[PDB]
Amino acid sequence: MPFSDFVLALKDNPYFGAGFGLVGVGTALAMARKGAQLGLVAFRRHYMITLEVPARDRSYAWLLSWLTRHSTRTQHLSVETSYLQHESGRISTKFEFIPSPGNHFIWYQGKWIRVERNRDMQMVDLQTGTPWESVTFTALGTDRKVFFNILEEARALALQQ
Amino acid sequence: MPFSDFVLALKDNPYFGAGFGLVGVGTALAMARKGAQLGLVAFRRHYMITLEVPARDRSYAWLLSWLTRHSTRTQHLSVETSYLQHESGRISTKFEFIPSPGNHFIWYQGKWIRVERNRDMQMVDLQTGTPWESVTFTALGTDRKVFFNILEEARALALQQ
Amino acid sequence: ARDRSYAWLLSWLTRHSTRTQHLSVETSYLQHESGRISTKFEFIPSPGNHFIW
Amino acid sequence: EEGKTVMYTAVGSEWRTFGYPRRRRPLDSVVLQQGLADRIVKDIREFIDNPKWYIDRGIPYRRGYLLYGPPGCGKSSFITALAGELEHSICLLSLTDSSLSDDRLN
Amino acid sequence: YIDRGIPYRRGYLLYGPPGCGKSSFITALAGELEHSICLLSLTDSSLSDDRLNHLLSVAPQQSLVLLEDVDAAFLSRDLAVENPIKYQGLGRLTFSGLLNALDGVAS
Amino acid sequence: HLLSVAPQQSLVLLEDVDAAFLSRDLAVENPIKYQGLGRLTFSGLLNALDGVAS
Amino acid sequence: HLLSVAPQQSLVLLEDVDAAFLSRDLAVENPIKYQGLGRLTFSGLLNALDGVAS
Ligand SMILES: Nc1ncnc2c1ncn2[C@@H]1O[C@H](COP(=O)(O)OP(=O)(O)OP(=O)(O)O)[C@@H](O)[C@H]1O
Ligand SMILES: Nc1ncnc2c1ncn2[C@@H]1O[C@H](COP(=O)(O)OP(=O)(O)OP(=O)(O)O)[C@@H](O)[C@H]1O
Ligand SMILES: [Mg+2]
Ligand SMILES: [Mg+2]
């Protein structure tokens, strides 16, 4: 009875026709959401490069210094006060600007890198002040040598000045 | 009275017909949601294999090392700075890349494994730095020997180099 | 849970639960009259809504 | 776990197995003074086999043993061999622990 | 060892005036035997008797456990004559714990 | 760990070593007591300066 | 750190220095014990006042 009686019962109500019309809408809506996730995942896996740096590595320090230096004209900075000893023998306050947390864009080597200064989540870490800060270098392409070049240049700049 | 009077009262309003047309829509929507969960559960139970590895096992260390080595051209890496002693007698910085947390895909033994570097949830664990990090090897199929082969190869690679 | 009434009432719920099928296990060592001790599998109603008459 | 000896340990307030079941040490592999091993085995098996003699007189059904002597003469090895012979397990208790209290010990 | 019931363990002690070649010989021996070295610090702060037993029970296969400068873990000589062998350390390790870990029932 | 991850081309400087541990009469005495604040021991320093893992 | 980030054109004032550490008979004795409350040592103060990183 559930098969035959319902089919007649559903066919009796014209609102049922609009109902299965809405049923197809819901099925298409669920498919559309699924299509989005798979497309994003495939695009990230095949055409994007990502380099996360934790705060537990010296590479974090060198990369942060290189981001302070090479930031083009970034206008989302944060202040950092330090005492700089002049060659005259005295010390004066030095106003240094570091890119504040957010999404910044650079044009290194003809690409458009999408560095992101990750903020603090839960104040848990080791060998530091426990802020668990991080940076994520995202760029469009398939070559990995860009991030290696960035890291090597950061090390060279750290060994410079 | 509730049976007879309501039936006449419902039949009086033509909007009632559309409402019970919408009632069937709600029942179908709930059924469709239930159909999704049971389908997912059955598919996972019958045609997929999953191997979770906690951070409390040496298997975690070996498998993490093997994931660092065999990652194909994965472009979702994270840095890991270490000092490597050259045969010349000096030590230089070694830039090692480990797949950053996310979903990575490999083609081991003709399958498409779906490794996932689980992140830190609540920073509670023992015998480690308490990050509760994990990896989950998901693949399509019914054979379990693939994950055993992966673990054995990870152990062999750990005993190598 | 701050009252001995809790302990007594929990014990009474363990005993009088009719045929409740939402139980939880509780392993304890029961000393037999023969002089030895054996494991006792005791079932306490697991958290949830139970109905009695 | 048969053919091997299980060794438990104190984890909080419960006895949890420690490692894997160790292989049994043969009883004749431990050479004690003449008749000592037989005496101890007979005593412990008499205690195990007679709970009624304890119940009928109100005596608590417990027993304790003490092995003393200069180090390296075979106390721990004999205990392992005895546990293997009696098919018992060993619950290692460390009195000089940090988490051990009187209530926890009881 | 198996055919006679003897536990399959061995231990070595190298003693002498400082700088005569104990640690260097241990390193050379580990290289020769293709083993690894598990450095254990008895006078630690997180080391307990149960933790010591566990650590000695899960040592990597084909490895040498190395307890260097054992005499610094516990009081000695006049204290050895004295009733207690006091733990002159930082953690919760005891002389009996070390003795039972090195050669005991659960070793 | 700290002695194992020192930056390359650097000099590790342990200034005023005699203040770390008891000395002279204690050096003659059986233990070289750590007259300090942390959880460092004489054997630990000895093995760090020149040991197996140095 | 505190001695390294003092405001410019300022005088650091350490008043009653003799109360920080044991003295006289202890100064003759091998250790200069810290008769204080925190985790400061005589060598630490000596290196902070005039050391390598001062
Ligand atoms: N009577 C014995 N027969 C055979 N082997 C023995 C005997 N006594 C000691 N041994 C051997 O000596 C070693 C250690 O002995 P064991 O641990 O039993 O000594 P102990 O006197 O109980 O010391 P401790 O209390 O410190 O453990 C083992 O290799 C064990 O086989
Ligand atoms: N027999 C030896 N041949 C070559 N070098 C040696 C020898 N003995 C000692 N040395 C050298 O002495 C130094 C330290 O030696 P080592 O660490 O082995 O000594 P030790 O006896 O363990 O002393 P300590 O307990 O003070 O460390 C190293 O430079 C090592 O090369
Ligand atoms: Mg013993
Ligand atoms: Mg040495």
mmCIF file of N, CA, C and O in Angstrom, chain B residues 72-151:
data_model
loop_
_atom_site.group_PDB
_atom_site.id
_atom_site.type_symbol
_atom_site.label_atom_id
_atom_site.label_comp_id
_atom_site.label_asym_id
_atom_site.label_seq_id
_atom_site.Cartn_x
_atom_site.Cartn_y
_atom_site.Cartn_z
ATOM 1 N N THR B 72 55.214 13.477 -3.282
ATOM 2 C CA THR B 72 55.161 13.839 -4.705
ATOM 3 C C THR B 72 55.537 15.317 -4.806
ATOM 4 O O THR B 72 56.523 15.735 -4.178
ATOM 5 N N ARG B 73 54.801 16.131 -5.557
ATOM 6 C CA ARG B 73 55.078 17.558 -5.700
ATOM 7 C C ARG B 73 54.104 18.401 -4.889
ATOM 8 O O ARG B 73 53.641 19.445 -5.356
ATOM 9 N N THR B 74 53.766 17.949 -3.681
ATOM 10 C CA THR B 74 52.794 18.644 -2.846
ATOM 11 C C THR B 74 53.204 20.096 -2.640
ATOM 12 O O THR B 74 54.371 20.399 -2.384
ATOM 13 N N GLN B 75 52.231 20.997 -2.774
ATOM 14 C CA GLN B 75 52.465 22.434 -2.722
ATOM 15 C C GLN B 75 51.732 23.082 -1.553
ATOM 16 O O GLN B 75 51.316 24.239 -1.634
ATOM 17 N N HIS B 76 51.563 22.343 -0.465
ATOM 18 C CA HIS B 76 50.951 22.837 0.764
ATOM 19 C C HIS B 76 51.850 22.521 1.947
ATOM 20 O O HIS B 76 51.427 21.962 2.959
ATOM 21 N N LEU B 77 53.125 22.868 1.815
ATOM 22 C CA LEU B 77 54.152 22.445 2.749
ATOM 23 C C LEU B 77 54.302 23.449 3.888
ATOM 24 O O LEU B 77 53.759 24.554 3.861
ATOM 25 N N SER B 78 55.061 23.043 4.903
ATOM 26 C CA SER B 78 55.478 23.923 5.982
ATOM 27 C C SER B 78 56.969 23.735 6.224
ATOM 28 O O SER B 78 57.520 22.654 5.998
ATOM 29 N N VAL B 79 57.620 24.803 6.679
ATOM 30 C CA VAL B 79 59.072 24.800 6.795
ATOM 31 C C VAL B 79 59.491 24.120 8.095
ATOM 32 O O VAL B 79 58.729 24.030 9.061
ATOM 33 N N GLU B 80 60.730 23.627 8.111
ATOM 34 C CA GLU B 80 61.317 23.052 9.319
ATOM 35 C C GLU B 80 62.829 23.228 9.216
ATOM 36 O O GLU B 80 63.490 22.509 8.461
ATOM 37 N N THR B 81 63.363 24.181 9.975
ATOM 38 C CA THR B 81 64.782 24.505 9.930
ATOM 39 C C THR B 81 65.560 23.572 10.847
ATOM 40 O O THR B 81 65.163 23.344 11.994
ATOM 41 N N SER B 82 66.668 23.041 10.339
ATOM 42 C CA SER B 82 67.527 22.166 11.122
ATOM 43 C C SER B 82 68.966 22.364 10.676
ATOM 44 O O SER B 82 69.236 22.790 9.551
ATOM 45 N N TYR B 83 69.891 22.048 11.576
ATOM 46 C CA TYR B 83 71.314 22.164 11.294
ATOM 47 C C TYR B 83 71.829 20.822 10.793
ATOM 48 O O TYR B 83 71.712 19.807 11.487
ATOM 49 N N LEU B 84 72.388 20.817 9.588
ATOM 50 C CA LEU B 84 72.901 19.609 8.958
ATOM 51 C C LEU B 84 74.419 19.691 8.904
ATOM 52 O O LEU B 84 74.972 20.634 8.328
ATOM 53 N N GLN B 85 75.087 18.708 9.500
ATOM 54 C CA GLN B 85 76.543 18.683 9.516
ATOM 55 C C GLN B 85 77.055 18.102 8.206
ATOM 56 O O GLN B 85 76.809 16.931 7.901
ATOM 57 N N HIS B 86 77.767 18.916 7.436
ATOM 58 C CA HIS B 86 78.336 18.449 6.186
ATOM 59 C C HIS B 86 79.513 17.519 6.452
ATOM 60 O O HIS B 86 80.089 17.494 7.543
ATOM 61 N N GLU B 87 79.869 16.742 5.429
ATOM 62 C CA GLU B 87 81.022 15.859 5.536
ATOM 63 C C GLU B 87 82.332 16.632 5.607
ATOM 64 O O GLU B 87 83.350 16.064 6.015
ATOM 65 N N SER B 88 82.328 17.909 5.221
ATOM 66 C CA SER B 88 83.538 18.717 5.293
ATOM 67 C C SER B 88 83.929 19.045 6.725
ATOM 68 O O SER B 88 85.067 19.462 6.963
ATOM 69 N N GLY B 89 83.019 18.868 7.678
ATOM 70 C CA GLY B 89 83.284 19.147 9.074
ATOM 71 C C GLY B 89 82.506 20.310 9.642
ATOM 72 O O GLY B 89 82.481 20.474 10.867
ATOM 73 N N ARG B 90 81.869 21.119 8.804
ATOM 74 C CA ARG B 90 81.102 22.267 9.258
ATOM 75 C C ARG B 90 79.612 21.961 9.192
ATOM 76 O O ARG B 90 79.182 20.932 8.666
ATOM 77 N N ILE B 91 78.821 22.879 9.738
ATOM 78 C CA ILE B 91 77.375 22.728 9.823
ATOM 79 C C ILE B 91 76.716 23.909 9.127
ATOM 80 O O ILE B 91 77.133 25.059 9.303
ATOM 81 N N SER B 92 75.688 23.620 8.334
ATOM 82 C CA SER B 92 74.935 24.637 7.620
ATOM 83 C C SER B 92 73.446 24.409 7.838
ATOM 84 O O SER B 92 73.004 23.300 8.145
ATOM 85 N N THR B 93 72.675 25.482 7.680
ATOM 86 C CA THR B 93 71.233 25.402 7.867
ATOM 87 C C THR B 93 70.603 24.563 6.763
ATOM 88 O O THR B 93 70.932 24.719 5.584
ATOM 89 N N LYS B 94 69.694 23.673 7.148
ATOM 90 C CA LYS B 94 68.976 22.818 6.212
ATOM 91 C C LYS B 94 67.507 23.212 6.219
ATOM 92 O O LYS B 94 66.854 23.170 7.267
ATOM 93 N N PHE B 95 66.992 23.591 5.052
ATOM 94 C CA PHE B 95 65.591 23.979 4.905
ATOM 95 C C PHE B 95 64.803 22.751 4.475
ATOM 96 O O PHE B 95 64.854 22.341 3.314
ATOM 97 N N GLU B 96 64.074 22.160 5.414
ATOM 98 C CA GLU B 96 63.268 20.980 5.144
ATOM 99 C C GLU B 96 61.793 21.347 5.155
ATOM 100 O O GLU B 96 61.334 22.098 6.021
ATOM 101 N N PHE B 97 61.054 20.812 4.190
ATOM 102 C CA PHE B 97 59.643 21.118 4.017
ATOM 103 C C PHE B 97 58.797 19.908 4.383
ATOM 104 O O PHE B 97 59.003 18.813 3.851
ATOM 105 N N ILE B 98 57.845 20.118 5.284
ATOM 106 C CA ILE B 98 56.899 19.088 5.699
ATOM 107 C C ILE B 98 55.514 19.534 5.248
ATOM 108 O O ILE B 98 55.196 20.729 5.335
ATOM 109 N N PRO B 99 54.681 18.634 4.726
ATOM 110 C CA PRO B 99 53.328 19.031 4.306
ATOM 111 C C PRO B 99 52.556 19.679 5.444
ATOM 112 O O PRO B 99 52.354 19.082 6.504
ATOM 113 N N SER B 100 52.124 20.916 5.212
ATOM 114 C CA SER B 100 51.369 21.657 6.204
ATOM 115 C C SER B 100 49.990 21.029 6.386
ATOM 116 O O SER B 100 49.528 20.271 5.530
ATOM 117 N N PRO B 101 49.326 21.310 7.506
ATOM 118 C CA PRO B 101 48.008 20.713 7.752
ATOM 119 C C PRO B 101 47.037 20.990 6.615
ATOM 120 O O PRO B 101 46.969 22.101 6.084
ATOM 121 N N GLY B 102 46.288 19.964 6.243
ATOM 122 C CA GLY B 102 45.396 20.050 5.108
ATOM 123 C C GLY B 102 45.176 18.670 4.521
ATOM 124 O O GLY B 102 45.589 17.659 5.088
ATOM 125 N N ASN B 103 44.516 18.654 3.368
ATOM 126 C CA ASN B 103 44.200 17.418 2.662
ATOM 127 C C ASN B 103 45.140 17.279 1.471
ATOM 128 O O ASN B 103 45.106 18.096 0.546
ATOM 129 N N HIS B 104 45.980 16.250 1.499
ATOM 130 C CA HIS B 104 46.915 15.961 0.424
ATOM 131 C C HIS B 104 46.578 14.622 -0.218
ATOM 132 O O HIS B 104 46.042 13.720 0.431
ATOM 133 N N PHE B 105 46.893 14.501 -1.505
ATOM 134 C CA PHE B 105 46.533 13.332 -2.296
ATOM 135 C C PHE B 105 47.788 12.706 -2.885
ATOM 136 O O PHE B 105 48.633 13.410 -3.447
ATOM 137 N N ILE B 106 47.909 11.387 -2.751
ATOM 138 C CA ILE B 106 49.047 10.637 -3.262
ATOM 139 C C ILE B 106 48.499 9.536 -4.169
ATOM 140 O O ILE B 106 47.306 9.236 -4.164
ATOM 141 N N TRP B 107 49.387 8.934 -4.955
ATOM 142 C CA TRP B 107 49.032 7.871 -5.890
ATOM 143 C C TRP B 107 49.828 6.609 -5.587
ATOM 144 O O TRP B 107 50.430 5.991 -6.467
ATOM 145 N N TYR B 108 49.843 6.208 -4.319
ATOM 146 C CA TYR B 108 50.583 5.018 -3.926
ATOM 147 C C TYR B 108 49.883 3.756 -4.416
ATOM 148 O O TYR B 108 48.692 3.555 -4.162
ATOM 149 N N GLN B 109 50.636 2.905 -5.117
ATOM 150 C CA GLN B 109 50.176 1.577 -5.532
ATOM 151 C C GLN B 109 48.867 1.640 -6.316
ATOM 152 O O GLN B 109 47.975 0.808 -6.147
ATOM 153 N N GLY B 110 48.751 2.640 -7.185
ATOM 154 C CA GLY B 110 47.606 2.727 -8.067
ATOM 155 C C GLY B 110 46.322 3.199 -7.426
ATOM 156 O O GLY B 110 45.283 3.205 -8.092
ATOM 157 N N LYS B 111 46.355 3.596 -6.161
ATOM 158 C CA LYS B 111 45.197 4.142 -5.473
ATOM 159 C C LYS B 111 45.373 5.647 -5.317
ATOM 160 O O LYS B 111 46.377 6.225 -5.738
ATOM 161 N N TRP B 112 44.380 6.290 -4.711
ATOM 162 C CA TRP B 112 44.421 7.728 -4.459
ATOM 163 C C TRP B 112 44.172 7.945 -2.970
ATOM 164 O O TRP B 112 43.039 8.175 -2.543
ATOM 165 N N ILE B 113 45.239 7.876 -2.187
ATOM 166 C CA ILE B 113 45.149 8.036 -0.741
ATOM 167 C C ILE B 113 44.898 9.502 -0.410
ATOM 168 O O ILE B 113 45.354 10.408 -1.114
ATOM 169 N N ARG B 114 44.154 9.741 0.670
ATOM 170 C CA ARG B 114 43.690 11.080 1.012
ATOM 171 C C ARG B 114 44.210 11.540 2.368
ATOM 172 O O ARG B 114 43.419 11.960 3.218
ATOM 173 N N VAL B 115 45.523 11.429 2.590
ATOM 174 C CA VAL B 115 46.111 11.795 3.875
ATOM 175 C C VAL B 115 45.638 13.175 4.305
ATOM 176 O O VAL B 115 45.378 14.055 3.477
ATOM 177 N N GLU B 116 45.519 13.363 5.616
ATOM 178 C CA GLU B 116 45.086 14.632 6.186
ATOM 179 C C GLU B 116 45.871 14.878 7.462
ATOM 180 O O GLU B 116 45.787 14.085 8.404
ATOM 181 N N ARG B 117 46.628 15.971 7.494
ATOM 182 C CA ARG B 117 47.413 16.331 8.672
ATOM 183 C C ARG B 117 46.499 17.041 9.660
ATOM 184 O O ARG B 117 46.225 18.235 9.526
ATOM 185 N N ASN B 118 46.015 16.301 10.653
ATOM 186 C CA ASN B 118 45.174 16.893 11.683
ATOM 187 C C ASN B 118 45.978 17.886 12.509
ATOM 188 O O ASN B 118 47.163 17.679 12.783
ATOM 189 N N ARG B 119 45.325 18.971 12.904
ATOM 190 C CA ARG B 119 45.972 20.068 13.598
ATOM 191 C C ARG B 119 45.795 19.885 15.106
ATOM 192 O O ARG B 119 45.416 18.812 15.584
ATOM 193 N N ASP B 120 46.106 20.929 15.868
ATOM 194 C CA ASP B 120 45.902 20.925 17.309
ATOM 195 C C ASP B 120 44.505 21.424 17.664
ATOM 196 O O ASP B 120 44.054 22.460 17.166
ATOM 197 N N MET B 121 43.815 20.673 18.527
ATOM 198 C CA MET B 121 42.475 21.038 18.979
ATOM 199 C C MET B 121 42.498 21.750 20.327
ATOM 200 O O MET B 121 42.083 22.908 20.429
ATOM 201 N N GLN B 122 42.998 21.080 21.367
ATOM 202 C CA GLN B 122 42.930 21.632 22.713
ATOM 203 C C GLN B 122 44.277 21.623 23.426
ATOM 204 O O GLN B 122 44.329 21.953 24.618
ATOM 205 N N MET B 123 45.363 21.279 22.731
ATOM 206 C CA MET B 123 46.715 21.325 23.289
ATOM 207 C C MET B 123 46.830 20.476 24.553
ATOM 208 O O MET B 123 47.387 20.898 25.569
ATOM 209 N N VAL B 124 46.292 19.262 24.481
ATOM 210 C CA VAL B 124 46.378 18.288 25.562
ATOM 211 C C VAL B 124 46.894 16.982 24.979
ATOM 212 O O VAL B 124 46.304 16.446 24.033
ATOM 213 N N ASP B 125 47.987 16.476 25.538
ATOM 214 C CA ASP B 125 48.559 15.186 25.163
ATOM 215 C C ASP B 125 49.640 14.854 26.183
ATOM 216 O O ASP B 125 49.922 15.637 27.096
ATOM 217 N N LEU B 126 50.240 13.678 26.026
ATOM 218 C CA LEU B 126 51.308 13.220 26.899
ATOM 219 C C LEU B 126 52.445 12.661 26.057
ATOM 220 O O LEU B 126 52.256 12.269 24.902
ATOM 221 N N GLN B 127 53.637 12.643 26.654
ATOM 222 C CA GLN B 127 54.857 12.127 26.033
ATOM 223 C C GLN B 127 55.269 12.929 24.801
ATOM 224 O O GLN B 127 56.045 12.442 23.972
ATOM 225 N N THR B 128 54.764 14.149 24.664
ATOM 226 C CA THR B 128 55.113 15.015 23.544
ATOM 227 C C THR B 128 54.975 16.462 24.006
ATOM 228 O O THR B 128 54.894 16.738 25.207
ATOM 229 N N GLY B 129 54.946 17.390 23.050
ATOM 230 C CA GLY B 129 54.677 18.785 23.320
ATOM 231 C C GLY B 129 53.215 19.109 23.503
ATOM 232 O O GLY B 129 52.835 20.282 23.499
ATOM 233 N N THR B 130 52.386 18.079 23.664
ATOM 234 C CA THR B 130 50.942 18.212 23.812
ATOM 235 C C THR B 130 50.268 19.035 22.708
ATOM 236 O O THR B 130 49.543 19.990 22.996
ATOM 237 N N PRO B 131 50.492 18.697 21.420
ATOM 238 C CA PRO B 131 49.704 19.352 20.371
ATOM 239 C C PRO B 131 48.520 18.521 19.893
ATOM 240 O O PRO B 131 47.636 19.047 19.213
ATOM 241 N N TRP B 132 48.472 17.247 20.273
ATOM 242 C CA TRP B 132 47.502 16.284 19.750
ATOM 243 C C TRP B 132 47.340 16.444 18.237
ATOM 244 O O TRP B 132 46.291 16.836 17.726
ATOM 245 N N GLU B 133 48.427 16.176 17.524
ATOM 246 C CA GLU B 133 48.406 16.145 16.071
ATOM 247 C C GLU B 133 48.245 14.709 15.593
ATOM 248 O O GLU B 133 48.677 13.763 16.256
ATOM 249 N N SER B 134 47.610 14.550 14.434
ATOM 250 C CA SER B 134 47.300 13.223 13.927
ATOM 251 C C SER B 134 47.265 13.252 12.407
ATOM 252 O O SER B 134 47.217 14.316 11.785
ATOM 253 N N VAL B 135 47.311 12.062 11.816
ATOM 254 C CA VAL B 135 47.145 11.879 10.381
ATOM 255 C C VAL B 135 46.084 10.812 10.164
ATOM 256 O O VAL B 135 45.990 9.851 10.935
ATOM 257 N N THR B 136 45.273 10.988 9.125
ATOM 258 C CA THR B 136 44.213 10.042 8.791
ATOM 259 C C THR B 136 44.370 9.640 7.333
ATOM 260 O O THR B 136 44.205 10.471 6.435
ATOM 261 N N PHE B 137 44.686 8.371 7.099
ATOM 262 C CA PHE B 137 44.849 7.843 5.750
ATOM 263 C C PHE B 137 43.508 7.300 5.277
ATOM 264 O O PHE B 137 43.036 6.273 5.773
ATOM 265 N N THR B 138 42.893 7.988 4.321
ATOM 266 C CA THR B 138 41.616 7.582 3.754
ATOM 267 C C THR B 138 41.814 7.220 2.291
ATOM 268 O O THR B 138 42.499 7.939 1.557
ATOM 269 N N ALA B 139 41.224 6.104 1.872
ATOM 270 C CA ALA B 139 41.340 5.661 0.493
ATOM 271 C C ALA B 139 40.092 4.883 0.113
ATOM 272 O O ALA B 139 39.369 4.370 0.970
ATOM 273 N N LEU B 140 39.849 4.800 -1.191
ATOM 274 C CA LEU B 140 38.706 4.070 -1.717
ATOM 275 C C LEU B 140 39.111 2.630 -1.998
ATOM 276 O O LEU B 140 40.088 2.381 -2.711
ATOM 277 N N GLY B 141 38.366 1.695 -1.440
ATOM 278 C CA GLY B 141 38.646 0.289 -1.645
ATOM 279 C C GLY B 141 38.248 -0.513 -0.424
ATOM 280 O O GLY B 141 37.727 0.012 0.556
ATOM 281 N N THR B 142 38.511 -1.817 -0.510
ATOM 282 C CA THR B 142 38.200 -2.739 0.570
ATOM 283 C C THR B 142 39.418 -3.419 1.176
ATOM 284 O O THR B 142 39.306 -3.966 2.279
ATOM 285 N N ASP B 143 40.565 -3.403 0.504
ATOM 286 C CA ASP B 143 41.755 -4.053 1.027
ATOM 287 C C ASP B 143 42.430 -3.181 2.079
ATOM 288 O O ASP B 143 42.502 -1.956 1.953
ATOM 289 N N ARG B 144 42.930 -3.834 3.128
ATOM 290 C CA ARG B 144 43.640 -3.150 4.198
ATOM 291 C C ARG B 144 45.154 -3.221 4.047
ATOM 292 O O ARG B 144 45.867 -2.501 4.754
ATOM 293 N N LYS B 145 45.656 -4.052 3.131
ATOM 294 C CA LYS B 145 47.095 -4.253 3.011
ATOM 295 C C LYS B 145 47.831 -3.001 2.558
ATOM 296 O O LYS B 145 49.048 -2.914 2.750
ATOM 297 N N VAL B 146 47.133 -2.035 1.958
ATOM 298 C CA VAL B 146 47.802 -0.826 1.485
ATOM 299 C C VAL B 146 48.381 -0.046 2.657
ATOM 300 O O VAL B 146 49.532 0.407 2.621
ATOM 301 N N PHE B 147 47.597 0.112 3.723
ATOM 302 C CA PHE B 147 48.071 0.873 4.873
ATOM 303 C C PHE B 147 49.167 0.124 5.619
ATOM 304 O O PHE B 147 50.107 0.741 6.135
ATOM 305 N N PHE B 148 49.068 -1.204 5.687
ATOM 306 C CA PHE B 148 50.140 -1.986 6.290
ATOM 307 C C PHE B 148 51.431 -1.841 5.496
ATOM 308 O O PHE B 148 52.517 -1.714 6.075
ATOM 309 N N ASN B 149 51.330 -1.854 4.165
ATOM 310 C CA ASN B 149 52.503 -1.630 3.331
ATOM 311 C C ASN B 149 53.079 -0.242 3.564
ATOM 312 O O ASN B 149 54.302 -0.070 3.616
ATOM 313 N N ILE B 150 52.212 0.761 3.702
ATOM 314 C CA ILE B 150 52.681 2.120 3.957
ATOM 315 C C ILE B 150 53.440 2.180 5.277
ATOM 316 O O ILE B 150 54.514 2.782 5.368
ATOM 317 N N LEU B 151 52.893 1.551 6.318
ATOM 318 C CA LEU B 151 53.556 1.567 7.619
ATOM 319 C C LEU B 151 54.897 0.843 7.570
ATOM 320 O O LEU B 151 55.892 1.319 8.133
#
